[PDB]
Ligand binder design. Structure first.
Ligand SMILES: [Cl-]
Ligand SMILES: [Cl-]
Length: 162
C-alpha cells in the first residue's frame, strides 16, 4: 500500500474520455479534463495534455504519465500551501497518503477550505475529524471512496483498502 495504489483503486483506469460522477470530462486515472460541456473542448484539452492528436483515446502508458504528473502536483501544492503544509507535516505516513488523496480528489483550494477538520487532524482528534469529514458534499457524492479515505485518516491503517 502506497498513494499510487490507493488512488488507482479509488479512481479506476479508463483509456477513453468519460464522464465523471459530477458531469465532467475525465480520462486515465482521475484526470479532470474540462468542466465545460463540450466533448470537443475535451478532446482539445486531452489533445493538448498528451502532445498528440488524440482522438479521445490514450494508451495506458499515457494514462500513467498523467497520473505521475498529478500525484506530483498534489504533493507540491500541499507543501507550498500555508494552510496545508503544517497539517501534512504533523501526520504519520499512512495518514499523509490519505491527505494526498483528499487533495488529488479535490483541489488544493478545495480543501484548504476544510477548515475545521484541518484543525481537528492537526490536533490528532481522529474520531472527530472523521465525523466532520463526512459532513460534506464530497462524502454525499461519492460515499464509498470517501469512507475509505476517512477511515484511513481516522485509523492510520490501510485496512479499508485489504
Ligand atoms: Cl495536464
Ligand atoms: Cl466511490
Amino acid at each position: 500500500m502506497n498513494i499510487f495504489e490507493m488512488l488507482r483503486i479509488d479512481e479506476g483506469l479508463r483509456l477513453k474520455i468519460y464522464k465523471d460522477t459530477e458531469g465532467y470530462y475525465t480520462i486515465g486515472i482521475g484526470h479532470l479534463l474540462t468542466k465545460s460541456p463540450s466533448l470537443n473542448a475535451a478532446k482539445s484539452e486531452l489533445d493538448k495534455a498528451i502532445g498528440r492528436n488524440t482522438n479521445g483515446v490514450i494508451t495506458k502508458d499515457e494514462a500513467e504519465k498523467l497520473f505521475n504528473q498529478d500525484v506530483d502536483a498534489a504533493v507540491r501544492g500541499i507543501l507550498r500551501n500555508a494552510k496545508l503544509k503544517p497539517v501534512y507535516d504533523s501526520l504519520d505516513a499512512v495518514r499523509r497518503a490519505a491527505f494526498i488523496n483528499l487533495v488529488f480528489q479535490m483541489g488544493e483550494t478545495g480543501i484548504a477550505g476544510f477548515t475545521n477538520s484541518l484543525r481537528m487532524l492537526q490536533q490528532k482528534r481522529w474520531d472527530e475529524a472523521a465525523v466532520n469529514l463526512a459532513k460534506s458534499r464530497w462524502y454525499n457524492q461519492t460515499p464509498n471512496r470517501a469512507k475509505r479515505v476517512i477511515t484511513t485518516l481516522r485509523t492510520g491503517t490501510w485496512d479499508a483498502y485489504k
